[PDB]
Amino acid sequence: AAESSIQVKNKGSIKLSNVKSVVNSSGKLVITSRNTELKLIDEFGRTKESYKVPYGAVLAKGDGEQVAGGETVANWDPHTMPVITEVSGFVRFTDMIDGQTITRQSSLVVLDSAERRPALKIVDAQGNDVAQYFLPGKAIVQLEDGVQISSGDTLARIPQ
């Protein structure tokens, strides 16, 4: 079941618990909490389905609304866990080494721990200092410096 889409059997209002509200590039929000709870309340307090939503997921419909059922209410990458940006603006890259920590596929790898993870905060506008960015093995960032990326958005992380 590689499809990350989730179906709703019956028309029950979605209730989200144990979640962190983060503003994304759109009206939807991204959950940064690993443990999340989903419940359905159609006409009474009895819950119907539970499911499970991992970290870094985008909900299709807002919390507390009554979904008609049969349609996905939250979508996420079923293979990669995105890391949201706490600061909106240009991406600040520290110790950018070419030929050793660069893998052309722009989409370029960040660094390799075995080959060598500098941490820097996202710039406010161009290079202003405002958050620690951790780069594990095979971590790749497709956003170059000065991309002016908004908060709540993440490129492919390429898990090892």
PDB file of C-alpha atoms in Angstrom:
ATOM      1  CA  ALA A   1       0.000   0.000   0.000  1.00  0.00           C
ATOM      2  CA  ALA A   2       2.302   2.745  -1.282  1.00  0.00           C
ATOM      3  CA  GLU A   3      -0.664   5.145  -1.485  1.00  0.00           C
ATOM      4  CA  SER A   4      -0.470   7.661   1.362  1.00  0.00           C
ATOM      5  CA  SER A   5      -4.081   8.723   0.782  1.00  0.00           C
ATOM      6  CA  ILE A   6      -6.553   7.714   3.494  1.00  0.00           C
ATOM      7  CA  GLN A   7     -10.246   7.032   2.912  1.00  0.00           C
ATOM      8  CA  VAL A   8     -13.197   7.884   5.158  1.00  0.00           C
ATOM      9  CA  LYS A   9     -15.945   5.272   5.364  1.00  0.00           C
ATOM     10  CA  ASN A  10     -18.750   7.465   6.724  1.00  0.00           C
ATOM     11  CA  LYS A  11     -19.542  11.166   6.947  1.00  0.00           C
ATOM     12  CA  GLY A  12     -17.938  12.002  10.285  1.00  0.00           C
ATOM     13  CA  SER A  13     -16.459  15.299  11.441  1.00  0.00           C
ATOM     14  CA  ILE A  14     -12.684  15.023  11.776  1.00  0.00           C
ATOM     15  CA  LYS A  15     -11.151  15.676  15.198  1.00  0.00           C
ATOM     16  CA  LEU A  16      -7.372  16.044  15.461  1.00  0.00           C
ATOM     17  CA  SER A  17      -5.616  15.638  18.813  1.00  0.00           C
ATOM     18  CA  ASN A  18      -1.971  15.814  19.911  1.00  0.00           C
ATOM     19  CA  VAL A  19      -0.894  18.010  16.998  1.00  0.00           C
ATOM     20  CA  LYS A  20       1.255  21.081  16.401  1.00  0.00           C
ATOM     21  CA  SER A  21      -0.178  23.856  14.228  1.00  0.00           C
ATOM     22  CA  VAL A  22       2.368  25.238  11.750  1.00  0.00           C
ATOM     23  CA  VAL A  23       1.430  27.673   8.986  1.00  0.00           C
ATOM     24  CA  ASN A  24       2.427  26.336   5.569  1.00  0.00           C
ATOM     25  CA  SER A  25       2.695  28.006   2.158  1.00  0.00           C
ATOM     26  CA  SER A  26      -1.087  27.578   1.787  1.00  0.00           C
ATOM     27  CA  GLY A  27      -4.152  27.626   4.033  1.00  0.00           C
ATOM     28  CA  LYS A  28      -3.394  24.085   5.179  1.00  0.00           C
ATOM     29  CA  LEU A  29      -1.192  23.332   8.185  1.00  0.00           C
ATOM     30  CA  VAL A  30       1.664  20.886   8.763  1.00  0.00           C
ATOM     31  CA  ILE A  31       1.917  18.735  11.894  1.00  0.00           C
ATOM     32  CA  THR A  32       5.392  18.590  13.444  1.00  0.00           C
ATOM     33  CA  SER A  33       4.410  16.195  16.260  1.00  0.00           C
ATOM     34  CA  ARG A  34       5.345  12.546  15.761  1.00  0.00           C
ATOM     35  CA  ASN A  35       2.344  11.226  17.716  1.00  0.00           C
ATOM     36  CA  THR A  36      -1.014  12.343  16.297  1.00  0.00           C
ATOM     37  CA  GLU A  37      -4.599  11.194  16.826  1.00  0.00           C
ATOM     38  CA  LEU A  38      -7.516  11.310  14.382  1.00  0.00           C
ATOM     39  CA  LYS A  39     -11.129  10.624  15.331  1.00  0.00           C
ATOM     40  CA  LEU A  40     -14.534  10.884  13.669  1.00  0.00           C
ATOM     41  CA  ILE A  41     -17.650  12.363  15.284  1.00  0.00           C
ATOM     42  CA  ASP A  42     -20.689  12.157  12.990  1.00  0.00           C
ATOM     43  CA  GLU A  43     -23.731  12.644  15.244  1.00  0.00           C
ATOM     44  CA  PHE A  44     -22.692  11.489  18.744  1.00  0.00           C
ATOM     45  CA  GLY A  45     -19.524  11.259  20.808  1.00  0.00           C
ATOM     46  CA  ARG A  46     -18.777   7.699  19.692  1.00  0.00           C
ATOM     47  CA  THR A  47     -15.582   7.463  17.648  1.00  0.00           C
ATOM     48  CA  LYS A  48     -15.489   5.392  14.470  1.00  0.00           C
ATOM     49  CA  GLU A  49     -11.980   5.347  12.957  1.00  0.00           C
ATOM     50  CA  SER A  50      -8.516   6.120  14.321  1.00  0.00           C
ATOM     51  CA  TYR A  51      -5.846   5.807  11.577  1.00  0.00           C
ATOM     52  CA  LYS A  52      -2.462   7.477  12.216  1.00  0.00           C
ATOM     53  CA  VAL A  53      -0.743  10.555  10.778  1.00  0.00           C
ATOM     54  CA  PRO A  54       3.081  10.779  10.826  1.00  0.00           C
ATOM     55  CA  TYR A  55       5.156  13.922  11.241  1.00  0.00           C
ATOM     56  CA  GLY A  56       5.202  16.537   8.498  1.00  0.00           C
ATOM     57  CA  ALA A  57       1.752  15.824   7.053  1.00  0.00           C
ATOM     58  CA  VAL A  58      -0.612  18.229   5.291  1.00  0.00           C
ATOM     59  CA  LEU A  59      -4.313  17.994   6.115  1.00  0.00           C
ATOM     60  CA  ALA A  60      -6.657  18.363   3.149  1.00  0.00           C
ATOM     61  CA  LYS A  61      -9.546  19.681   5.262  1.00  0.00           C
ATOM     62  CA  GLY A  62      -9.377  21.675   8.464  1.00  0.00           C
ATOM     63  CA  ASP A  63      -9.985  20.316  11.935  1.00  0.00           C
ATOM     64  CA  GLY A  64     -13.541  20.247  13.249  1.00  0.00           C
ATOM     65  CA  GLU A  65     -15.261  20.246   9.852  1.00  0.00           C
ATOM     66  CA  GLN A  66     -17.706  17.529   8.796  1.00  0.00           C
ATOM     67  CA  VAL A  67     -16.271  15.698   5.789  1.00  0.00           C
ATOM     68  CA  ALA A  68     -18.872  14.018   3.582  1.00  0.00           C
ATOM     69  CA  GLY A  69     -16.785  10.829   3.585  1.00  0.00           C
ATOM     70  CA  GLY A  70     -15.000   8.859   0.903  1.00  0.00           C
ATOM     71  CA  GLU A  71     -12.401  11.598   0.372  1.00  0.00           C
ATOM     72  CA  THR A  72      -8.920  12.058   1.787  1.00  0.00           C
ATOM     73  CA  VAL A  73      -8.601  14.508   4.670  1.00  0.00           C
ATOM     74  CA  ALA A  74      -4.795  14.502   5.054  1.00  0.00           C
ATOM     75  CA  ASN A  75      -1.945  13.874   2.618  1.00  0.00           C
ATOM     76  CA  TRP A  76       1.747  13.288   3.269  1.00  0.00           C
ATOM     77  CA  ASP A  77       4.805  11.777   1.640  1.00  0.00           C
ATOM     78  CA  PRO A  78       4.723   8.006   2.341  1.00  0.00           C
ATOM     79  CA  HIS A  79       8.509   7.671   1.922  1.00  0.00           C
ATOM     80  CA  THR A  80      10.090  10.900   3.227  1.00  0.00           C
ATOM     81  CA  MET A  81       9.462  13.013   6.315  1.00  0.00           C
ATOM     82  CA  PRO A  82       9.765  16.726   5.453  1.00  0.00           C
ATOM     83  CA  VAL A  83      11.293  19.177   7.920  1.00  0.00           C
ATOM     84  CA  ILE A  84       9.425  22.478   8.049  1.00  0.00           C
ATOM     85  CA  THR A  85      11.175  25.851   8.066  1.00  0.00           C
ATOM     86  CA  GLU A  86      10.649  27.835  11.263  1.00  0.00           C
ATOM     87  CA  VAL A  87      11.913  31.037   9.593  1.00  0.00           C
ATOM     88  CA  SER A  88      10.536  32.195   6.243  1.00  0.00           C
ATOM     89  CA  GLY A  89      13.064  33.698   3.859  1.00  0.00           C
ATOM     90  CA  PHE A  90      16.328  32.897   2.134  1.00  0.00           C
ATOM     91  CA  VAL A  91      17.986  29.570   2.915  1.00  0.00           C
ATOM     92  CA  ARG A  92      21.366  30.001   4.615  1.00  0.00           C
ATOM     93  CA  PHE A  93      23.954  27.345   3.740  1.00  0.00           C
ATOM     94  CA  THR A  94      27.146  27.064   5.796  1.00  0.00           C
ATOM     95  CA  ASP A  95      30.329  25.284   4.673  1.00  0.00           C
ATOM     96  CA  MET A  96      29.117  24.499   1.152  1.00  0.00           C
ATOM     97  CA  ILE A  97      31.840  22.249  -0.284  1.00  0.00           C
ATOM     98  CA  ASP A  98      31.782  21.443  -4.006  1.00  0.00           C
ATOM     99  CA  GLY A  99      33.170  18.136  -5.257  1.00  0.00           C
ATOM    100  CA  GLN A 100      32.933  16.394  -1.870  1.00  0.00           C
ATOM    101  CA  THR A 101      29.500  17.347  -0.481  1.00  0.00           C
ATOM    102  CA  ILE A 102      27.859  17.972  -3.878  1.00  0.00           C
ATOM    103  CA  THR A 103      25.975  15.345  -5.907  1.00  0.00           C
ATOM    104  CA  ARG A 104      24.442  16.679  -9.119  1.00  0.00           C
ATOM    105  CA  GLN A 105      21.170  15.029 -10.122  1.00  0.00           C
ATOM    106  CA  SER A 106      19.434  23.131  -8.231  1.00  0.00           C
ATOM    107  CA  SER A 107      19.014  19.697  -6.631  1.00  0.00           C
ATOM    108  CA  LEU A 108      22.330  19.124  -4.847  1.00  0.00           C
ATOM    109  CA  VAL A 109      23.237  17.048  -1.804  1.00  0.00           C
ATOM    110  CA  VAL A 110      24.120  18.889   1.400  1.00  0.00           C
ATOM    111  CA  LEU A 111      26.872  16.789   2.987  1.00  0.00           C
ATOM    112  CA  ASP A 112      27.865  13.253   3.960  1.00  0.00           C
ATOM    113  CA  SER A 113      28.887  12.420   7.524  1.00  0.00           C
ATOM    114  CA  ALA A 114      31.050   9.504   6.371  1.00  0.00           C
ATOM    115  CA  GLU A 115      32.801  11.701   3.797  1.00  0.00           C
ATOM    116  CA  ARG A 116      33.435  14.427   6.385  1.00  0.00           C
ATOM    117  CA  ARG A 117      26.807  18.729   9.401  1.00  0.00           C
ATOM    118  CA  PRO A 118      26.910  22.524   9.695  1.00  0.00           C
ATOM    119  CA  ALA A 119      23.858  24.120  11.298  1.00  0.00           C
ATOM    120  CA  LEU A 120      22.462  27.515  10.325  1.00  0.00           C
ATOM    121  CA  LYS A 121      19.201  29.413  10.681  1.00  0.00           C
ATOM    122  CA  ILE A 122      17.008  30.420   7.755  1.00  0.00           C
ATOM    123  CA  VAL A 123      17.685  33.995   6.666  1.00  0.00           C
ATOM    124  CA  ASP A 124      14.943  36.566   7.203  1.00  0.00           C
ATOM    125  CA  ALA A 125      15.158  38.206   3.766  1.00  0.00           C
ATOM    126  CA  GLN A 126      18.606  37.714   2.189  1.00  0.00           C
ATOM    127  CA  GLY A 127      21.163  36.999   4.927  1.00  0.00           C
ATOM    128  CA  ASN A 128      19.727  38.286   8.196  1.00  0.00           C
ATOM    129  CA  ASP A 129      20.157  36.111  11.286  1.00  0.00           C
ATOM    130  CA  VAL A 130      17.013  34.987  13.102  1.00  0.00           C
ATOM    131  CA  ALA A 131      16.733  27.553  14.602  1.00  0.00           C
ATOM    132  CA  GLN A 132      19.298  24.814  13.943  1.00  0.00           C
ATOM    133  CA  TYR A 133      19.377  22.839  10.688  1.00  0.00           C
ATOM    134  CA  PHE A 134      20.628  19.262  11.075  1.00  0.00           C
ATOM    135  CA  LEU A 135      21.873  17.324   8.037  1.00  0.00           C
ATOM    136  CA  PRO A 136      21.961  13.538   8.577  1.00  0.00           C
ATOM    137  CA  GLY A 137      23.452  11.028   6.163  1.00  0.00           C
ATOM    138  CA  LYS A 138      22.373  11.459   2.530  1.00  0.00           C
ATOM    139  CA  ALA A 139      20.496  14.671   3.381  1.00  0.00           C
ATOM    140  CA  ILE A 140      19.861  16.752   0.253  1.00  0.00           C
ATOM    141  CA  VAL A 141      18.400  20.254  -0.078  1.00  0.00           C
ATOM    142  CA  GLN A 142      17.150  21.391  -3.491  1.00  0.00           C
ATOM    143  CA  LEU A 143      16.901  25.054  -2.413  1.00  0.00           C
ATOM    144  CA  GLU A 144      19.997  27.169  -3.011  1.00  0.00           C
ATOM    145  CA  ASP A 145      20.996  30.262  -1.059  1.00  0.00           C
ATOM    146  CA  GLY A 146      18.703  33.239  -1.543  1.00  0.00           C
ATOM    147  CA  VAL A 147      15.733  31.102  -2.605  1.00  0.00           C
ATOM    148  CA  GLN A 148      13.493  33.123  -0.225  1.00  0.00           C
ATOM    149  CA  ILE A 149      11.489  30.039   0.732  1.00  0.00           C
ATOM    150  CA  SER A 150       8.376  30.617   2.826  1.00  0.00           C
ATOM    151  CA  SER A 151       7.706  28.828   6.104  1.00  0.00           C
ATOM    152  CA  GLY A 152       6.069  25.411   6.178  1.00  0.00           C
ATOM    153  CA  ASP A 153       7.615  24.252   2.887  1.00  0.00           C
ATOM    154  CA  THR A 154      10.288  21.596   2.400  1.00  0.00           C
ATOM    155  CA  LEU A 155      11.991  19.998  -0.592  1.00  0.00           C
ATOM    156  CA  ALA A 156      12.937  16.338  -0.955  1.00  0.00           C
ATOM    157  CA  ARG A 157      15.081  15.163   1.958  1.00  0.00           C
ATOM    158  CA  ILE A 158      16.221  11.861   0.372  1.00  0.00           C
ATOM    159  CA  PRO A 159      16.373   9.605   3.465  1.00  0.00           C
ATOM    160  CA  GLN A 160      19.348   7.252   3.560  1.00  0.00           C
TER     161      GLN A 160
END
